[PDB]
């Protein structure tokens, strides 16, 4: 069985396993690819890292609008671009 070991999580994964790796004050979405080299690919392209937190696609959060009169609700869209959008509450 081909595996990947992640030195941060301390776990051994099989090919195709996905998992979270907290690092750099963010959360990386990692995949054990293997490829005969214990190849791991990790990405934040489908997370939003905003207001010091890590959000998955569909997660929401709040931040004040620049005018200060009202709050925004934001949602993480991802789109391989860490895309998020916010509407007034």
């Amino acid at each position: 069985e081909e595996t990947c070991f992640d030195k941060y999580t301390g776990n051994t994964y099989r090919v195709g396993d996905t998992y979270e790796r907290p690092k750099d004050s963010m959360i990386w979405d990692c995949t054990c690819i293997g490829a005969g080299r214990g190849r791991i690919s990790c990405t934040i392209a489908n997370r939003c890292h905003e207001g010091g937190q890590s959000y998955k696609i569909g997660d929401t959060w709040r931040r004040p609008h620049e005018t200060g009169g009202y709050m925004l609700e934001c949602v993480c869209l991802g789109n391989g671009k860490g895309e998020w959008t916010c509407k007034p509450i």
Partner: peptide
Amino acid sequence: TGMSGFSETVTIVEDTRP
């Protein structure tokens, strides 16, 4: 009245057994 943006967008590939 709203706001939108893009977070840091990075992909890392590591060969743990090169």
